[PDB]
Design a protein around this nucleic acid. Structure first.
Ligand SMILES: [Mg+2]
Ligand SMILES: [Mg+2]
Ligand SMILES: [Mg+2]
Ligand SMILES: [Zn+2]
Ligand SMILES: [Zn+2]
Ligand SMILES: [Zn+2]
Ligand SMILES: [Zn+2]
Ligand SMILES: [Zn+2]
Ligand SMILES: [Zn+2]
Lengths: 104, 104
DNA sequence: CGACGCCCTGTCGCTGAGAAGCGTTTGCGTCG
DNA sequence: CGACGCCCTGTCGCTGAGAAGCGTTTGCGTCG
């Protein structure tokens, strides 16, 4: 399998350090292939905090969005999504506007 | 990867033995997990000859259809599909009417 | 097309990826 | 729902499956 396991992270286990590490400007991102995570929208693997989709039927990294991408393409803040127990990713909601998803 | 490799079989290498082994009645199928092949439509893994999709972008077993399923659900004969160098499977043509494909 | 100046500080291309098959599985109608 | 008789000899459920990320990647307009 090429799919990374999807782990639903409860809102109670989100720390202040993770909230602080949310990216506020994409030019400030730190790239790391070992420790980073990929944003579904911009497809960059970086160390900033990203969203966690809480739909049990979600899979892989499709639910991971960086701060700038979420706020610019969906009007949502990553902090609110992390603190939302019912948050579903735009791919789960069927409203993802990334190049691939809107190409289909 | 869970995907079986898709191998395009040229029409010149289709033998008379394969043509003879095309199923003409689903009740006559012989099941075998090691030697059989799965029909995408009825999802039965049997030893009768099945179609080979020749679209290079096809993948997996989605292009494999047994005789009865192809003739009953698409009006096509497996022999003609095997002897057709341009044949594409109904999933590739976007006209598959199996339970899963029409469920989507 | 790349510097170059603005404000709303941003994004797509390409490769290789995209299940399969066992289990509970076989059309229609009538009827007990 | 399962035998039961016809003709056009047939089919779906469920589980687990359903990429990810490096490379060529960052908005608008004008203009050289
Ligand atoms: Mg896979
Ligand atoms: Mg391939
Ligand atoms: Mg799973
Ligand atoms: Zn992003
Ligand atoms: Zn999701
Ligand atoms: Zn998308
Ligand atoms: Zn079949
Ligand atoms: Zn195909
Ligand atoms: Zn199908």
């Amino acid at each position: 399998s090429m799919t990374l396991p999807h782990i639903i992270r409860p809102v109670e286990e989100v720390t202040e350090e993770e909230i602080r590490n949310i990216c506020s400007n994409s030019r400030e991102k730190i790239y790391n292939r070992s420790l980073g995570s990929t944003c579904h929208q911009c497809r960059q693997k970086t160390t900033d905090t990203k969203t966690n989709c809480r739909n049990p039927d979600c899979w892989g990294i499709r639910g991971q969005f960086c701060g700038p991408c979420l706020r610019n393409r969906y009007g949502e803040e990553v902090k609110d999504a992390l603190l939302d127990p019912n948050w579903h990713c735009p791919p789960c909601r069927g409203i993802c506007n990334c190049s691939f998803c809107r190409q289909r």
